[PDB]
Amino acid sequence: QNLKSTDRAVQQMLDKAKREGIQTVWDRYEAMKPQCGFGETGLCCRHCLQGPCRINPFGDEPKVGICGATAEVIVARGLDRSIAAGAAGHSGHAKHLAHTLKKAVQGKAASYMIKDRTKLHSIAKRLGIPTEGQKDEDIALEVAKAALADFHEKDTPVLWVTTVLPPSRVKVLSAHGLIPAGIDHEIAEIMHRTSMGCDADAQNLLLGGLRCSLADLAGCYMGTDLADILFGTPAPVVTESNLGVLKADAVNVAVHGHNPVLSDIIVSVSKEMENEARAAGATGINVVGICCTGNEVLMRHGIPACTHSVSQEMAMITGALDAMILDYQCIQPSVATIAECTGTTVITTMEMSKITGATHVNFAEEAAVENAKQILRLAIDTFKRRKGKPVEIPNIKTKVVAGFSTEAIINALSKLNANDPLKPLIDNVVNGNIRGVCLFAGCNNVKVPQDQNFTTIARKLLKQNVLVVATGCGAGALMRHGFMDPANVDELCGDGLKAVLTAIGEANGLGGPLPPVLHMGSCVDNSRAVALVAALANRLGVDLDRLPVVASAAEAMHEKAVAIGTWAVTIGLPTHIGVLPPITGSLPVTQILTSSVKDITGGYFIVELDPETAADKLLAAINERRAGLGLPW
Amino acid sequence: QNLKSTDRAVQQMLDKAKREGIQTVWDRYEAMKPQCGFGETGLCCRHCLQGPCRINPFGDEPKVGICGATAEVIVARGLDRSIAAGAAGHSGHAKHLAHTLKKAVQGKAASYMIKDRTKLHSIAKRLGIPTEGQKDEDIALEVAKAALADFHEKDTPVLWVTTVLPPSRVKVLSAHGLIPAGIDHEIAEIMHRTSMGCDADAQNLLLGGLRCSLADLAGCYMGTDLADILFGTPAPVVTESNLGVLKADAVNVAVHGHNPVLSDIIVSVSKEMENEARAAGATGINVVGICCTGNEVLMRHGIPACTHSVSQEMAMITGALDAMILDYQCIQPSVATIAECTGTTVITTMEMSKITGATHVNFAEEAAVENAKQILRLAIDTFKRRKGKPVEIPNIKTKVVAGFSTEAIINALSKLNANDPLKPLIDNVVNGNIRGVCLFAGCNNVKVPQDQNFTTIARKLLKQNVLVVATGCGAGALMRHGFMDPANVDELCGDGLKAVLTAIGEANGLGGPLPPVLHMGSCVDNSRAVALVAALANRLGVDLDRLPVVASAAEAMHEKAVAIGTWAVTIGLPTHIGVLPPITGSLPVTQILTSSVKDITGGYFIVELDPETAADKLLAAINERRAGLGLPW
Ligand code: SF4
Ligand code: SF4
Ligand code: FES
Ligand code: FES
């Protein structure tokens, strides 16, 4: 099973699924092989009913689409639609939160409130909204109005782009026409320009893609900002991860999907119901996280993470998962079928994300607590049906220190330099104790043995003194293999990095170091990494494409991950992707994305499927940035 | 060549392309066969980087997508993305016009103005904008603001849906949650819900598709409304169509694409430049139309239509097409390559729609006349380079009576009943002289011999006394085969229909009938057919799904045509599609779209590739509607 996942708890559940005849994502992948090489290379188009069109990567006809679309047009149009789809997910999430904040401060949803007043006022100031003499509720109404206004054209560009990057970066982007006019405007323009008989110039198409990726960045930053207002900015927390966080004698409830509007309410209402759960024979309600909504409640509340991404079905295979509470995105719809076998109650809550065979409980913010109780009573009832049944929870978990919002990182660093917190970090980049920074982001993918690329690359970079930060299921991969446990710093980190993590941790009273990898949150919380990197660029007086900072979507899957990698390139970072995106069927598109975009944004994709080679390429990119700043490397 | 096109002028140009070795759309189609059956049936998904996933229509594995997506989910998600793409095109067009109207009345674009003041005031009244005591420019600013507001959520739904359908239809749609909240909002929600791990219930997905199709309807109606304000509501005109409208001794300039913002300015500036063209040896500038922008200037100015859709390359093969002036959508990008062979100057004008190898002249409304002169001077220069070269313009053209906006149809009918214009039409539906109404819409498709389905179906329906109306390239097909020439009424029309067309035409002083088919305009002007049908429903006091009115996208191609067919079903019409959409790989999705949607909206798709059978099915649908109104049939 280690060819499927490097996670031992997942391997144990794969053996249970095999002997019980429960088909998994890995079995469905095997059944799909060999996969279509036209789609794998990007040389397929179904944008009109004259299709499907395909182009042989090599050889004879077909060489061109029926309408005359070349390989470079077809590849660029498909990639642009993936970016637009990713932007539609992250910004759908953000829009949901904007509507929740508005309802809250209009008195329409009393289960929600302004929890981080400080962040509300800072966002208002950043956006140019006056706070002096204003009621918090009125400021929040104006922030929610500004959030919603960024979805459409108006007399300003998207402010969750132009106010969150330094002016010199905005200027570079504006000079190339890359600043989005409106988030949903750009998504629709992509769908228009990529439809039949429209845009048919690869560079033009890909510039539109870069712009739409910044609409995705705006949605991510907006979702982090609004979720911090509503639910609190994360601070360092200690918890655990992997399937051993399930407890046979508790009602085990996973929150899965993306939006904390849902998750966060499940967490508080579940403790409210301890006594009812005990009344049912359970010790209590054990809320656990899957995917980004799990990361949201891990970061804010220390809720333990059960699993992530490709292995999500394995939580159900234990037999102990009484409920899986879903909102949207990244939920394998197989979970509704598996539930018939495992007893789990799978519950959808959002009207635009239903799964045939799952129970639907409409969630309304206006009725959030009651809707939550309804949902948790189904969970308790499911716990009751499994009294007497043995379960197989692998007794495998790791310790996880997390909660490293950008505010938390700056506060930690301020213990070493109170009035210039970023300076101790920059000092150690300059003296070589920190070689650079790498952000691990994005998914697992069934094509890659689960977590192998994240852990292989992260081990090489940590030994070379790279400060590693992580989000989403990249953070999930690293947490489940111990990279968020400070007890593993000696094993994993180079001496320079160890010295810095230890100095910061001691100054923070820890009696030891920060963990090897800093968990910066969910995938929208890649925006926190942008805030940190923009702050470092501003403090140094250089643009982002001069910093020794890189990103790696080492096992990417979702259209959202393609959008994140594309905005990482657009804001100026060397950006590794460890699965093949469907671009290899066009050399000119590949050359743009891996080379000539350097002359546009200064960032660039590094496509590399072999993780040791990827680590070497990421180190070379870091070291090239060091050299360009005149630093030793 | 008649297996490729039923148009004799196209056949002649196909012989010229063959002996000159110029590859055409039909050759690229042959080179693509056999096409992929997974894509043809809809059983392919590339929504994440675990893909491509496919499902065998029959047999053994693969049976399910890697994430667990079933065939019905994959088929429904692909269809929903096509609807969203279509909505993105028509509403991109509409948004462009809204911005042009705003610029015009703010003094920012003096080449544009309020030409149809009457329509401006009626649209304002329909939208609820006050006109009394207001400056036309202020009313127009408020209409343009309302147009732009319909792209995003606000305190009202999309008004270019709810104000253009009768209240009883709005109520039906609202009861099913189908009224769009914002045009670009719905497009983005589709892209979100269809991304990996999101919506996975076929009925839920398809309800979202129906709602997004009404966003496309709103974009079409908004684009017709705004283009009528700016450029005038069409009234009946007489012109010609097919390649014989090109003139060897003139500078031949085709306007191609969709938006009249461009086309309409080319038309007036070209007459301004007669003397310059004569100075170059030409008799003048001969502007001709291709595709919908050609339909826009045909309807408003009587500009002759050269060709449409699948045969658009053939205009260039004549050797006489000096320039092809493009905006966006439905332009085969092959035209940029063919131009190297034919001498034509292909000029793009919109920054989101470029074609490698074509000259780009940025068009700005603020500089429209100067930009137009620049463009037409390239055309004159191209004419000069071909002095001495023989050309081969087929001497084949038809007479075309067109210009039948809904206002023009009502005015024509008012000559028979001044204060109740729709009553003479309804009287003749009741007495059986008019069996029903059929709208032909949408594209040609290289899979169908060009125009064969439109003309075969239209001949059967006209003999059975159906009033036939047409738009877009359906109108193009029928015009090029003589269906818009009143001299062909005796040949084509049943005695009842002939009597009505003659009575209306005589009352209009024509000394003869209206033409066999009424041209209602471009594809956004399918909204004119909606206005007529909604007016008839309102006058009868019944909803649209009780009228004997059907639609046929007999040779559909573009995602826009899929969106139009889907909103035709959503507003209550039986809607034929004469090519296979990628739904046959899911019986449950097919059953929804062809049968159970009748219980939701009262409309339904009729998929039928054989045109004689399609005509029989369309007549049965009309006659079932007649029977339900208690009428003989
Ligand atoms: S848009 Fe062009 S390449 Fe794509 S399916 Fe249609 S004809 Fe083929
Ligand atoms: S979304 Fe599901 S069906 Fe589609 S490519 Fe990804 S794994 Fe395959
Ligand atoms: S031919 Fe396989 S993805 Fe289209
Ligand atoms: S397998 Fe051919 S369209 Fe994907």
Curated annotation (Swiss-Prot), chains A, B:
Membrane topology according to the record: Peripheral membrane protein
SUPFAM superfamilies (alphabetical): Prismane protein-like (SSF56821)
Source domain of life: Bacteria
Main location: cytoplasm
Comment on bound cofactor: Binds 3 [4Fe-4S] clusters per homodimer. Binds 2 [Ni-4Fe-5S] clusters per homodimer.
Cellular location(s): Cytoplasm; Cell membrane
Cofactor(s) listed: [4Fe-4S] cluster; [Ni-4Fe-5S] cluster
GO CC, one annotated term: plasma membrane
One Pfam family of this chain: Prismane
Subunit: Homodimer.
Family recorded in the similarity comment: Belongs to the Ni-containing carbon monoxide dehydrogenase family.
Protein name per its UniProtKB record: Carbon monoxide dehydrogenase 2
Organism expressing this protein natively: Carboxydothermus hydrogenoformans (strain ATCC BAA-161 / DSM 6008 / Z-2901)
Lineage start: Bacteria, Bacillati, Bacillota, Clostridia, Thermoanaerobacterales
